Design a protein around this ligand. Structure first.
Ligand SMILES: Nc1ncnc2c1ncn2[C@@H]1O[C@H](COP(=O)(O)OP(=O)(O)OP(=O)(O)O)[C@@H](O)[C@H]1O
Ligand SMILES: [Mn+2]
Ligand SMILES: [Mn+2]
Ligand SMILES: [Zn+2]
Length: 382
């Protein structure tokens, strides 16, 4: 949390000497190969007192610099590319102003993991629970890269409680809401709200996406689940895991749990016991489906779904400030995803302090270098 009276004086300087305007324009101009592509983009500025304006568009980079430095917006959201100039949508015939293109986006909030987190809750995050986002980035990014063939993926720290992903392949920017829904369904395993206890069910045959995602989780599960969260510490915690396991084997576990001493041994026990449960009496097929359902329910990414369906849904811009923490929405170095510390992310107050002691003078520089690598990969593919 932050004290929000300093923000305006900090924002003035940030938009004057620190915001990477050139790289930003390179990005949303996309080479200038399509006409009106930057000029038909919706921007949404949030000002002081949570007053926000929509359908703000601009002619060129300089126009953007000017109006941003004139409003010093608390928060900047990117929208869709529309049929006409967003800032002229009243002069257009009703029914002819329609969203046409936007990147495929993903919003991941840690709040959706409160049911499986024990250290933090609500908007809080700590190094112990942050591994979820790491695995989230690992799982989704892999599927985005290999199962769908998307080459241009930008991962961004949302500034507080999770991360964002912008997918910018030219054909992906054209996808309708229908295809985006289908993509989210392909990527989702944790179903059900607070109403249901067991939120993951696996079919008898395993789809490669599930096997590969499980294998990703099997890299982190020891460190995250059995040590940092201690999901099997005592009865208070392990009864939450038994709630999603068949009851005919509960007794044997509770016994074997009390006689055990820590979460490692209890997990090894649960594995053996689940690999001996018979789901179907016809066949003598046994497997780790319950083990896998547990690991998925506790570690698999939960996506904010309605963020990805809408073509015209707004998402916080990269390098925009989060007005409730002061943190800058910085890109995530994928080659160092495990090393990403959300607590080393520069705040606006902090880099303005660094500057007075251009953006490459500050701790924002390596993040801009990440953004430029993403942009140069966009340039090569053209
Ligand atoms: N009233 C609104 N109108 C339009 N878009 C909205 C509105 N409220 C939120 N959004 C969009 O929803 C997106 C994601 O919601 P969310 O609360 O998760 O924000 P965030 O930027 O991801 O920050 P956080 O790290 O807290 O998740 C935002 O980037 C914003 O663009
Ligand atoms: Mn978010
Ligand atoms: Mn959200
Ligand atoms: Zn935590």
């Amino acid at each position: 949390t932050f004290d929000p009276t300093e923000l305006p004086e900090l924002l003035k300087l940030y938009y004057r000497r620190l915001f990477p305007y050139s790289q930003y324009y390179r990005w949303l101009n996309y080479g200038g190969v399509i006409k009106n592509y930057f000029q038909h983009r919706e921007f949404s500025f949030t000002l002081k007192d949570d007053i926000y304006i929509r359908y703000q568009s601009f002619n060129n980079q300089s126009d953007l610099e000017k109006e941003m430095q004139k409003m010093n917006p608390y928060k900047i959201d990117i929208g869709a590319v529309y049929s006409h100039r967003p800032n002229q949508h009243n002069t257009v015939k009703l029914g002819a102003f329609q969203a046409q293109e936007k990147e495929l986006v993903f919003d991941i909030d840690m709040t959706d993991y409160d049911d499986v987190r024990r250290c933090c809750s609500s908007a809080d995050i700590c190094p112990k629970c942050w591994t979820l986002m790491t695995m989230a980035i690992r799982i989704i990014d892999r599927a985005l890269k290999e199962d769908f063939g998307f080459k241009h993926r930008l991962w961004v720290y949302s500034g507080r409680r999770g991360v964002h992903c912008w997918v910018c392949d030219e054909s992906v920017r054209k996808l309708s809401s229908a295809v985006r829904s289908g993509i989210v369904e392909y990527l989702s395993l944790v179903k059900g709200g607070q109403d249901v206890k067991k939120k993951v069910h696996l079919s008898e045959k395993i789809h490669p996406f599930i096997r590969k995602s499980i294998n990703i989780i099997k890299k982190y599960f020891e460190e995250y689940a059995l040590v940092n969260q201690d999901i099997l510490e005592n009865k208070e915690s392990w009864d939450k895991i038994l709630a999603l396991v068949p009851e005919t084997i509960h007794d044997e576990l509770q016994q074997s749990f009390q006689k055990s001493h820590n979460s490692l041994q209890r997990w090894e026990h649960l594995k053996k016991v689940a690999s001996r449960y018979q789901n179907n009496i016809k066949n003598d097929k046994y497997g780790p489906w319950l083990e896998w359902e547990i690991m998925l329910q506790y570690c698999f990414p939960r996506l904010d779904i309605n963020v990805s369906k809408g073509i015209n849904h707004l998402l916080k811009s990269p390098f925009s400030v989060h007005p409730k923490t002061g943190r800058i929405s910085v890109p995530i170095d994928l080659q160092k995803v495990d090393q990403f510390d959300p607590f080393t992310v520069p705040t606006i107050s902090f880099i303005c302090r660094e500057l007075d002691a251009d953006y490459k003078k500050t701790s924002l520089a390596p993040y801009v270098k990440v953004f430029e690598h993403f942009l140069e990969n966009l340039d090569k593919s053209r």
